[PDB]
């Protein structure tokens, strides 16, 4: 349809002469053909989104519709790239641009004609029956993700009149006559699908096969598991990033994604830059990581809109991937911001909240969001086992209870990993608080655990009983400091002393500090139980602390220096250390004790 | 007290056994009893397809219908659907139905009757009228295949009571 | 037998239906129609998309000539000049029978669990109606759970409404499943049955009640409901009054004992807020709408216990306490409908102690009338007051340990002391399958008394002490 | 143990077998009797779709 | 006039062609024929509250203006009787019904008019004159009550014509003929009042006598006068239920009502079934402490206004009966939900609270609702006495 | 912004940017915002300021083409000495790093009265260390905040509970604290101090303690310059 602009309001504007759309359907407008999609609608007047600015337009500008909602490019050439919150390719603009500045109206496509691939057909033989996700060839994309795996979208059957031969090819080419119900049935090397409505599965399935994150606390005390999600806290000084560069490099991850909403710019910019520095730290030293990453970074200056779509286009793009039956993580800059842009965008459309300043579906619309998640079983005769994982990086407000969008993460998630204020005013980090944290995976995990480290769990149920309770004779002690005290007190205060400047301290940036294994971790966590439960045994019969202590020396220290165990070392030699370790903290105990 | 578990785990498996197969039995039985019902429906819908291929019959009845899709409408100005074959039935038709109208209608007979050149689908049609007002948006299916559709859904309870009678512990009712 | 005559004309009486395609727009959730005949206010209505899908509606508010319909899956990307919609004449309703035993639905109710249609032997109101407070007696006779730490301090009679609250790090869905698993009616079932509702769980956690629900082999006893997450929040106030419908039919027709469980009125209470944030009114207080209180009183009422049949109704809610404390709405009215109220301690689960249960500021309200004998032993009554007083000086015991020095607490103390981990440790402490009678949770609790001289327990009639001291 | 174990190693199907058969005859006697009574509710249901039910609905 | 429903929103409704109706008025709205009430008129259009299920209505319906504001009926019948907030007769109701719900819909006068009565006509002749509040004759009811005094409805003038001898009558037969310009005026053995505005009284007197309750450390150190104002503090579990049940058998008041904002109900179950077997030992032990006193009690149930009218509904028949000649004690529930109940209420109306999520009017209301107690002196030619408690 | 957009990325300069007020800027905003009805956010003011506070930060930085860079220092005054009232707190949502000061410091004639502990630099781990600087600078500043908050923390707790639960390192931080806010944070209106002396002082204070309480300094740097 050919439209007129009626009225404008900054980033809303609206349309006369309509007739006959879709509320959420893509628009042309203006002379210069910006973007926007139709919210609200009523006789022939369309509330119209619009992803762009709005200068110098006038009544009566041309409107074109498009017909359809708004969708995102799946195919090859995705990985290893940078695009924005809808799906503009970063550098091709830049680089066709020649200038620093982002034009208005440009249409740069998703994902380049410009780049021939070596397709092989698959098993199916022309004149079979084909559905949507039955894979019917394969092309190479890149070393790590080679034989890109080609798909039939769903909502498409028939039956393969033709295939193409195998060979170099680009994009744009018909490669498998299909017939429903006549020819019609073209497909190229891509594909599209609206982001809204997320695709379908065969079914779903538990979870298991826990992630690992390289830092003891996570993985060691609240587990995380693969087809999971969590909400980590971030506060600059805890590691920011630390926890996403150390999942990238350590989590075996398929494919990684990350997106960026409030990038405040020098962020953006560095880590961008510095992922070419990392490495692929897996299965050989191979300089460029991103061929795991693509990213869609986004800052503040965009339009509101942008950074609405921008996680929906991310985790799009993970289940597009995933349906290959692979194994992918999130990484969400800040999904405050995101509330925020939200409560923005309803405000504006001139509809009153009701949570001091959030409209109430913001609860419906995260928990829709988040439901995409987990492990399931892929659709079609090739049986693909996939998995997305995600994380949601909580930016608070200064304050934990004053802002609902934590309520609603808490009654949603199943991991959620808190935070300590005073940590971070101790510089303590890692600094998270163990009182609040908490993981219900840890019931299911006992059956893998069993498998590697059956008695692993009751080990660090004790462990954690015993920092509870030091935290509670904490408040007893200070506000009476040393009294009449038995020598377990001084035992129960000492191993919590340890564990936390070992466990709840570790360098961001050391080779025996920031990244640890489950065995070496296993190991730590035994030899404290021995140390303290020896100790106190010990204590039992008289063996007053302070000689107790005299008589084993330094064995608290002999222990501390432990972090200082190199991993990736053989772990043999490691573990004999360990076992080593464990042997003569044991005969010594036994010896001088008596 | 080994003992004792594995006697509780075999327990345990016994009674998950109990379980699945009691439970199947019942989906058994209510799939069986749908079989029934389903035979019922479709010999009532063949008998509905026999009596609509019989034009004696149809037309008072059909005349009937439409004249219940004026009584719905109200309106003097509505446009009439139908299948090709009874046209000039629905056309004789005309003037008893717009009399009649009139009658049941405290307002004057009906001012027009209009019957555009579409026609309803003789194979997954089979009997039936379909009314919309002269603007055309508001529609009226009476249809037999909806009508019956709609029946058989809207009469379980009292259907149900007569294939298996009164039933028990539905003491207070 | 004459009900039938009704059931005949109605199940033999067919009305068509109305189709409009008077669309006058879609302004988010909610879709206007301006022609329109003779509207039926909040009925449900099938809409069709100009694409072969169709969805499911009910009527907001009406006007002359005009209605206002939300869609319960949402209005996205639907036209407004080729859709049609037809009004089913009718407000909702649902089948009903006595055999929906066994099976599962959806949060529509529709069954999910890929079995035949449910064949109702009725239909009926969604809702039902007030009962009169002439026509209803109190409750006695205390219901069994199998769970020691509840029933041997904190009974419940055949009736009483008592909600649990929860805390957001706190594992109480299986505590619900155990309940269930473990539920049952006292020896001296027979009609005991159970119904169960659930709102906007995670998939894993559907996947794992049913499986848990099915294998235990009690599905006989359940008919589940269940609304996930992804559901349309429309539909979740739809699920605690179908299931409430069920149970009053069941109990008030067939004289089963039922109990059921809503797991979280705080999802309920999310979503209703969702609703008349359609309608311009600015809701209350923290940004809630007033008449809560009489809309969960509508819901809990209709537990209760009648003279006229041997039905038994109880209703066991659940919440979640948003920032961890008693001052949100929610529970603060809750704590006025309901009748006692029982903690689930975060500490105690820091403590690893399963259940993380409480019992110090959880109380039954009208335990009284269902603790004496003919269904427990005597002993049970006050064995319960004893206990809970040494578990009070036990717990200053443990305050007591540095204030002045460990070794300066009273036989007395270091007696409560013992007792208390003692008792926290074994008598609390349930296993996740670990079931326990009534009889042998008090021997148990007897055992631990026995620890005290029989002159500390300075609260029971003499013979008691005297019979029960010394076995 | 295994001597309590073993028992059900081969009754399961028989016991299965059991159940099966102790609802057949009622099984298919649901067919047989709904056949027998098949013409009254067809015939009746067939009569009902066929009358009228002219009404100016009374408002 | 009986115009049909113009548009329908939730618990809000809109009628047209109403006329001739003042903004509080009942009305039977619909086919089911609800208990609505006006609350804002406006041009020809209104605003009308309902106080059941307003689902399934339609446009185009019958609605029928009752003429007046919310009120109740008094006469004989009142002793030994249980009702709702608006006044329903739930044990006629259920008897009838045979069912256990509260059909909606439901329709039953306050008072039976199977029932006859014998009744003794008073001493005025044809040609006298007569006032509101004055006493023309006596019915007896119960072994408890003498008997039920016939009194005339306030604002009544003019001279008798005719009148009803003595004998056996029911609560419809034209027992009386009087003319303040013509015979038109006439009565029956019961009449109504509405609830809002306080029954009127002849004058007041100070309380000075005291309350009887038998309890040593109350009525010994604490007491309250026959005619006063007293408070106590919730949570049952101290066991206040003492002062209920001696108040009911140990009280210088000869009538009691108790009036129940609305709870669980169990404890309006128990209550109810415990309380007609109380005993008392006027001329020898009489068990039926239920002739003392006629019981109204609510719940969640009810609607809002049902437990929003409980009281004001208690209160004067309070004053009605110490009108009567008679020394009343009332006894409530909890005021606590009835606050509830009205700040939801208001809410619903869309009111700006006062503060604490509470509008102005609670000030007010209270002051004036407690007004309405103490001793006095009303019509009646007699001029007997009463007092509220 | 504009000025200094086309100096900097047009003249390779390196320019630097003071706004003494972004208060008047949101009162400005906020007063033409009610002439026309808006539906208010938080105190008020339209929730989309966020959209305007970004771009007027989208401007800083550096870029390959350009030599020239812009830095942004904007003043803003604590309407009531407070972070989550609108304004600061979304400013803190977008901007990098912050200075705080505070009016106790004042009140104590300290110049400049600055509150170590709210004010944090999101941004300094790149532009430190060696190449530059000396590494020690990352342990020296963890070191100084953990032992002032000590010293903080510790002075609080006597003031409720006095000399019974002291430990000795408790009045050791104490003194620390006087004499660092004292000497360090003291500084003269035309005395610049280079990070070299600034570290010998930082030193210098630190020295009263043992090489076993500050676990912040790794052993390499806590052996370095314990002593010299």
């Not at chain 2, 009439?80 to 003037?95: F, H, N, Q």
Request: proline share 5%; net charge negative.
């Amino acid at each position: 349809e050919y439209g007129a602009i009626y009225s404008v309001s900054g980033p809303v504007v609206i349309a006369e002469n309509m007739i006959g759309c879709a509320m959420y359907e893509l628009v042309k407008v203006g002379h210069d053909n910006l973007v926007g999609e139709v919210i609200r609608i009523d006789g022939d007047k369309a509330t119209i989104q619009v992803y762009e600015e709005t200068a110098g337009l006038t009544v009566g500008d041309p409107v074109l519709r498009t017909g359809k909602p708004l969708s995102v490019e799946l195919g090859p050439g995705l990985m290893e790239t940078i695009y924005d919150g809808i799906q503009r390719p970063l550098k091709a603009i830049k680089e066709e641009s020649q200038s620093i500045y982002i034009p208005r109206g440009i249409d740069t496509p998703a994902l380049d004609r410009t780049i021939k691939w070596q397709f092989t057909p698959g098993k199916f033989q022309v004149g079979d029956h084909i559905s949507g996700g039955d894979i019917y060839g394969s092309v190479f994309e890149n070393s790590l993700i080679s034989s890109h795996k080609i798909l039939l979208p769903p909502r498409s059957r028939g039956t393969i009149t033709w295939i193409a031969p195998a060979g170099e090819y680009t994009l744009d080419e018909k490669i498998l006559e299909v017939e429903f119900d006549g020819k019609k049935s073209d497909f190229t090397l891509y594909h599209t699908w609206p982001v809204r409505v997320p695709r379908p599965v065969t079914e779903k399935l538990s979870a298991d096969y826990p992630l690992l994150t390289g830092q003891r606390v996570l993985d060691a005390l609240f587990p995380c598991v693969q087809g999971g999600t969590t909400c980590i806290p971030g506060a600059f000084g805890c590691g920011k990033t630390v926890i996403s560069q150390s999942l990238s490099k350590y989590s075996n991850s398929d494919a990684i994604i990350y997106v960026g909403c409030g990038e405040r710019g020098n962020e953006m910019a560095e880590v961008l830059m510095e992922f070419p520095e990392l490495y692929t730290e897996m299965s050989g030293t191979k300089e460029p990581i991103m061929k795991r990453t693509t990213l869609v970074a986004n800052t503040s200056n965009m339009p509101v809109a942008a950074r609405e779509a921008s996680i929906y286009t991310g985790i799009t793009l993970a289940e597009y991937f995933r349906d290959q039956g692979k194994n992918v993580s999130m990484i969400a800059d800040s999904s405050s911001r995101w509330a925020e842009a939200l409560r923005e965008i309803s405000g504006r459309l001139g509809e009153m909240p009701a949570d001091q300043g959030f409209p109430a579906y913001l609860g419906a619309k995260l928990a829709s969001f988040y439901e995409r998640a987990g492990k399931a079983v892929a659709l079609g005769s090739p049986d693909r086992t996939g998995s997305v994982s995600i994380v949601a990086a909580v930016s608070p407000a200064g304050g934990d209870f004053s802002d609902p969008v934590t309520t609603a993460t808490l009654g949603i998630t199943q991991v959620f990993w808190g935070l300590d204020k005073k940590l971070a005013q101790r510089k303590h980090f890692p600094s998270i608080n163990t009182s609040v944290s908490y993981s219900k995976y840890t019931n299911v995990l006992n059956k893998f655990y069993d498998s590697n480290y059956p008695e692993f769990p009751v080990l660090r149920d004790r462990m954690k009983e015993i920092l509870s309770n030091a935290e509670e004779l904490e408040q007893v002690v200070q506000l009476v400091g040393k009294s009449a005290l038995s020598d377990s007190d001084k035992i129960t205060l000492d191993v919590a002393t340890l564990i936390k400047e070992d466990f709840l301290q570790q360098n961001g940036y050391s080779t025996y500090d920031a990244f640890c294994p489950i065995w070496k971790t296993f190991d730590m966590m035994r030899a404290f139980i021995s140390y303290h439960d020896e100790a106190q045994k010990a204590v039992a019969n008289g063996a007053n602390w302070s000689k107790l202590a005299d008589s084993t020396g330094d064995v608290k220290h002999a222990v501390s220096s432990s972090k200082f165990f190199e991993p990736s070392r053989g772990e043999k030699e490691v573990h004999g250390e360990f076992e080593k370790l464990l042997s003569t903290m044991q005969e010594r105990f036994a010896e001088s004790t008596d | 007290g080994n003992f004792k578990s594995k006697l509780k785990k075999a327990m345990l498996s016994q009674q998950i056994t109990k379980s699945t197969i009691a439970n199947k039995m019942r989906l058994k039985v209510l799939s069986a009893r749908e079989q029934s019902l389903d035979g019922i429906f479709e010999e009532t819908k063949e008998k509905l397809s026999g009596i609509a291929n019989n034009r004696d019959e149809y037309k008072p009845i059909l005349q009937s219908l439409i004249v219940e899709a004026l009584l719905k409408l109200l309106e003097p100005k509505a446009i009439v659907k139908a299948l090709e074959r009874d046209v000039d039935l629905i056309e004789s038709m005309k003037d008893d139905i717009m009399r009649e109208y009139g009658e049941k209608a405290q307002r004057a007979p009906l001012e027009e009757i209009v019957i555009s050149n579409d026609y309803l689908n003789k194979d997954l049609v089979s009997g039936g009228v379909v009314v919309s007002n002269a603007s055309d948006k508001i529609e009226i299916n009476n249809t037999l295949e909806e009508r019956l559709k709609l029946l058989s859904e809207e009469a379980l309870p009292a259907i149900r009571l007569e294939l298996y009678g009164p039933s028990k512990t539905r003491k207070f009712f | 037998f004459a009900i039938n005559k009704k059931a005949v004309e109605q199940g033999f009486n067919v009305k068509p239906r109305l189709n409009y395609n008077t669309v006058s727009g879609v302004n988010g959730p909610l879709v206007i129609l301006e022609k329109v005949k003779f509207p039926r206010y909040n009925e449900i209505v099938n809409l069709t998309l100009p694409d072969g899908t169709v969805r499911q509606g009910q009527v907001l508010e009406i006007r002359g000539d005009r209605a206002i319909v939300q869609v319960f899956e949402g209005t996205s990307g639907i036209d407004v000049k080729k859709t049609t919609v037809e009004f089913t004449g009718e407000s909702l309703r649902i089948p009903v029978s006595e055999d929906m035993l066994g099976r599962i639905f959806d949060g529509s109710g529709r069954p999910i669990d890929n079995g035949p249609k449910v064949f109702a032997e009725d239909y009926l109101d969604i809702n039902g109606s007030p009962i009169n407070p002439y026509a209803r007696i109190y409750p006695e006779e205390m219901i069994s759970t199998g769970v020691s730490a509840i029933d041997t301090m904190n009974s419940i009679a055949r009736g009483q409404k008592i909600p649990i609250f929860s805390a957001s790090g706190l594992p109480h869905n299986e505590i619900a499943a155990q309940i269930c698993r473990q539920a049952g009616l006292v020896r001296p079932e027979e009609n005991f049955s159970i119904v169960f509702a659930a709102m906007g769980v995670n998939l894993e956690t559907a996947r794992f009640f049913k499986q848990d629900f099915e294998e235990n082999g009690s599905l006989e006893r359940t008919s589940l409901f269940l609304n996930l997450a992804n559901d349309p929040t429309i539909e979740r106030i739809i699920t605690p009054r179908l299931a409430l419908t069920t149970a009053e039919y069941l109990a008030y027709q067939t004289e089963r004992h039922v109990l059921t469980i809503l797991t979280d009125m705080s999802s309920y209470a999310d979503a209703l807020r969702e609703v008349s944030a359609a309608r311009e009114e600015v809701p209350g207080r923290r940004g809630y709408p007033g008449y809560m209180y009489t809309d969960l009183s509508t819901i809990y009422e209709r537990a209760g216990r009648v003279e006229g049949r041997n039905g038994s109704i109880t209703q066991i809610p659940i919440l979640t306490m948003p920032n961890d404390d008693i001052t949100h709405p929610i529970p603060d009215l809750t704590g006025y409908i309901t009748e006692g109220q029982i903690f689930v301690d975060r500490q105690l689960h820091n403590k690893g102690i399963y259940p993380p249960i409480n019992v110090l500021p959880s109380l039954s309200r009208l335990m009284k009338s269902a603790i004496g004998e003919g269904m427990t032993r005597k002993d049970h009554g006050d064995v319960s007051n004893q206990l809970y007083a040494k578990y009070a000086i036990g717990k200053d015991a443990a305050a007591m340990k540095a204030v002045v020095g460990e070794e300066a607490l009273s036989i007395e103390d270091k007696l409560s002391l013992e007792f208390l981990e003692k008792f926290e440790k074994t008598f609390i402490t349930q296993g996740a399958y670990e079931d326990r009678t009534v009889f042998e949770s008090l021997d148990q609790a007897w055992s631990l008394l026995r620890i005290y001289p029989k002159e500390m327990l300075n609260r029971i009639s003499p013979k008691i002490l005297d019979e029960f001291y010394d076995r | 143990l295994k001597e309590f174990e073993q028992k059900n190693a081969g009754g399961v199907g028989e016991l299965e077998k059991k159940a099966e058969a102790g609802v057949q005859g009622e099984l298919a006697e649901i067919k047989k009797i709904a056949e027998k009574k098949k013409d009254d509710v067809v015939k009746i249901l067939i009569e009902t779709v066929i009358k009228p039910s002219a009404e100016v609905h009374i408002n």
